[PDB]
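Saturday, quiet lab. Running sequence design on the structure tokens for the scaffold JK sent over.
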């Protein structure tokens, strides 16, 4: 009985190792997910810091155009400068349009990477399961050994220890499935936090284009104010 107690605790000592290696696996996969999110956030912020310099670049140009309006003269020259302003503004809107499209594809890049991680997690959890089940087979066989050789309370002291270290394996498998099904949660939460940043960048871009429009309108009324007299 001791030689079938020794080897069973060897087996159990094996399953706790299988488990904790699956859980180390999961937690590193999660750290990969967070560095993936931080890369995305860094990129969204920089794109914003570029939409801002786009606006300022456009606004210096347009304000000095408006100065050319204050000192301008001809209906002609007026419409020509208004022309230059709608032109410069269109440039800026196009550039932002590019930036945001960049942000959408980076978002998609990070989401499909997170689904790849989660799938890897799932399969390695399957591999981890079937290894434990092979272990259960080895236990069942060495028990059939200890049967076919020595020939009733021992038999049942081992057949109840083999059914315990199976219960062990099922709890450890359920623990691992709670981890896979929690890391999944963290990944979807981190995709939410980044869709918020894509929708904030869209908003900075829209509001900056709105300020530029107010500038062409100011300049328009001013062109008419000098047009009047």
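Result came back. Writing it out in full:
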């Amino acid at each position: 009985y001791k030689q079938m107690v020794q080897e069973l605790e060897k087996a159990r000592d094996r399953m706790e190792k299988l488990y904790k290696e699956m859980v180390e696996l999961i937690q590193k996969a999660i750290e990969l997910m967070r560095k993936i999110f931080q890369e995305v956030k860094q990129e969204v912020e920089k794109a914003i810091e570029e939409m801002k310099k786009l606006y300022d670049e456009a606004k210096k140009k347009i304000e000095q155009m408006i100065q050319q309006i204050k000192q301008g003269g001809d209906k002609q020259k007026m419409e020509e400068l208004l022309k230059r302003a709608k032109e410069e503004m269109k440039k800026v809107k196009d550039k932002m349009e590019k930036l945001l499209e960049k942000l959408k594809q980076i978002m998609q890049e990070a989401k499909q990477k997170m689904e790849k991680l989660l799938k890897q997690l799932k399969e390695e959890m399957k591999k981890m399961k079937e290894k434990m089940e092979k272990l259960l087979k080895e236990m069942k066989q060495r028990m059939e050994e200890v049967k076919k050789k020595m020939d009733d309370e021992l038999l049942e002291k081992i057949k109840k220890n083999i059914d315990d270290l199976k219960k062990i394996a099922e709890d450890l498998i359920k623990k691992a499935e709670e981890n896979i099904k929690e890391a999944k949660k963290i990944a979807e939460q981190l995709v939410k936090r980044a869709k918020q940043l894509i929708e904030k960048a869209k908003q900075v871009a829209e509001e900056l284009i709105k300020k530029i429009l107010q500038l062409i309108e100011k300049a328009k009324e001013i062109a008419e104010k000098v047009l009047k007299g």
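Notes for JK: Residues 1-229 form one domain. The helical segments are 6-70, 75-148, 155-158, 164-228. Ask whether to fix the surface positions before the next round.
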